[PDB]
């Protein structure tokens, strides 16, 4: 049906070549057409390199397609709506899962879509606002970001947050046409102090780079096999310690113990696509599987940098009752490895939740 | 200062935003060496090459004349650690300078030399990559130009031996299409 289809045409009248594959909206502008000033940009710009001449002959811009954004938004709306009962720590898990589901997949294309950045910001504000509703307050002085962004090891919610970033804004009149650039920024979300929050996107490696890395890592790997052959000495761990976690197949996945069995598995990637029909729940990770493709991201840094930005262990804990427990240190804090756990979450932040300074309130003395 | 830089950079999408965030803060200028030293270290130390951290170092140069200088210095500062750094992070660097030098933030090279005399097998790989990246952009012809007007010596000479080391070494890299004239010179 012409209605569902789409067509683009490249001719001396039309420089740009548009198309849509999978979730990606792609544009392609050659340098042989009018590219005017040649320039780099954020990794949202791919360079298409002639295989023959090793030259950059054109540029592909990525943009996150509409229907995708729509799906994510319905996924957040699924988290809000489908949970009226569920615990607040549970929702934050739902958010984190969906959010990495978007970010690991799209990565570069996210930064070139302003509509996404907006949607993420408002949606973070909606789930945090909902957790606020969960207790009874909307009062900001009662929910400083330290409670949401503390990795729950220290008793926070461990919320992954992409939405404190500034949102570029310039010239709607011209920006609807000529791609003017950035003359302004809008504040995404509040910060109690000047402060900071780290963004997911900064800790994920872009798709372009992981591709080039993949090619190089594999070629070098074959070299490591050849040198091992000529030496007759088999290869150890150390000569592979360099590339250990790198490459799209994630080279370490060769060394999986069960590797045999997986060698006889085929078409896994399509079965994942059709699991949505066999199983009721909605898989965001449908595109890949860690067993064939490895783990394509490591967020371990994000936690450390998160704790640093909040002022260190002493920074986050300064919002808690910890000094009440009279524990000598927090180095030994160990947690309990429609009932209390919610109710407990309040005590732990109770110095922050309840404040002598608030916007509006009637100060009440508990009974005795 | 060193911690604020990291947090501002880890926070921001795009490379544009971190500079705005960083400039905005109006941290003291002289430090405009170490800061940039921060960016070069902070990502290069960071696990794999990412386009962002390399762009940032460069813009930070065009905005103030000194920032450019601050970088070229920091490239010098490498000589001491050309051997010392472990053999991953060279994979981030070689390219990572590749992207400042393809886009013009070349002759600063010349300081770098090819000798069995003193080159670190580290440094060997470092420079090796640097060309196998920068080539992949300019495509080995524009590179033919840039060299031919470069007057890079410690790289390109005397020392017919070192002309075997040079030219051979660029058969090893594999490009070796800018080694011609030197081949003639051997003869």
């Amino acid at each position: 049906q012409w209605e569902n289809s789409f067509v683009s045409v490249y001719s001396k009248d039309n420089p740009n070549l548009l198309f849509n594959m999978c979730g990606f909206e792609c544009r392609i502008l050659p340098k042989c057409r009018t590219s005017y000033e040649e320039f780099t940009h954020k990794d949202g710009v791919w360079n298409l390199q002639n295989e023959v001449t090793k030259e950059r002959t054109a540029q592909c811009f990525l943009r996150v397609d509409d229907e995708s954004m729509q799906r994510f938004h319905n996924r957040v709306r699924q988290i809000l709506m489908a949970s009226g009962s569920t615990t607040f720590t549970k929702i934050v898990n739902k958010w984190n899962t969906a959010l990495i589901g978007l970010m690991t997949y799209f990565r570069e294309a996210v930064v070139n879509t302003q509509e996404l950045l907006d949607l993420l910001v408002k949606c973070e504000n909606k789930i945090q606002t909902r957790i606020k509703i969960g207790l009874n307050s909307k009062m900001p002085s009662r929910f400083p970001p330290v409670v949401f962004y503390t990795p729950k090891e220290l008793g926070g919610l461990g919320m992954l947050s992409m939405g404190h970033v500034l949102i570029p804004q310039s010239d709607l009149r011209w920006s609807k046409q000529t791609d003017v650039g950035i003359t302004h920024f809008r504040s995404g979300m509040s910060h109690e102090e000047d402060q900071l929050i780290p963004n997911l996107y900064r800790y994920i490696q872009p798709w372009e780079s992981e591709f080039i890395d993949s090619q190089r890592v594999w070629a070098e790997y074959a070299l490591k096999r050849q040198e091992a052959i000529a030496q007759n000495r088999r290869l150890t761990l150390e000569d592979l310690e360099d590339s250990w976690d790198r490459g799209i197949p994630r080279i370490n996945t060769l060394f999986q113990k069960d590797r045999h069995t997986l060698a006889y598995d085929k078409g896994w990637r399509v079965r994942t696509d059709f699991k949505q029909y066999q199983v009721l729940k909605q898989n965001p990770f449908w595109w890949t599987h860690q067993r064939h493709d490895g783990k394509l991201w490591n967020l371990n840094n994000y936690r450390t940098d998160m704790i640093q930005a909040l002022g260190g262990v002493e920074g986050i804990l300064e919002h808690t009752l910890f000094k009440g427990t009279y524990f000598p240190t927090w180095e030994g804090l160990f947690w309990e490895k429609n009932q209390i756990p919610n109710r407990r979450f309040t005590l732990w932040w109770s110095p922050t939740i309840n404040r002598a300074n608030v916007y509006v309130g009637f100060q009440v003395q508990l009974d005795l | 200062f060193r911690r604020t830089i990291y947090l501002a950079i880890q926070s921001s999408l795009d490379f544009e935003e971190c500079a705005h965030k960083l400039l905005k803060m109006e941290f003291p200028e002289s430090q405009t060496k170490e800061l940039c030293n921060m960016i070069l270290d902070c990502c290069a130390q960071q696990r794999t090459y990412e386009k962002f951290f390399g762009l940032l170092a460069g813009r930070f140069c065009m905005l103030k004349k000194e920032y450019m200088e601050s970088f070229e210095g920091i490239f010098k500062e490498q000589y001491d650690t050309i051997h010392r750094l472990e053999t991953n992070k060279l994979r981030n660097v070689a390219k990572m300078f590749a992207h400042l030098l393809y886009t013009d933030s070349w002759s600063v090279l010349e300081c770098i030399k090819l000798s069995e005399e003193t080159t670190t097998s580290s440094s060997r790989i470092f420079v090796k990559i640097f060309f196998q990246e920068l080539c992949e952009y300019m495509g080995l012809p524009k590179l033919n130009a840039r060299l031919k007007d470069e007057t890079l010596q410690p790289f390109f000479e005397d020392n017919p031996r070192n002309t075997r080391f040079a030219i051979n070494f660029f058969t090893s890299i594999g490009l070796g299409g800018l080694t011609d004239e030197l081949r003639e010179h051997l003869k």
Binding site: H184, F185 | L23
Partner: peptide
């Protein structure tokens, strides 16, 4: 001067609507 920038009104936006100008432009 709201120069066509910023939200019509920071009502549903999740933000405080604050627009400062790009401190690093050129």
């Amino acid at each position: 001067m709201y120069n066509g920038i910023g939200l019509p009104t920071p009502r549903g936006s999740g933000t405080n609507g604050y627009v400062q100008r790009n401190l690093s432009l050129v």
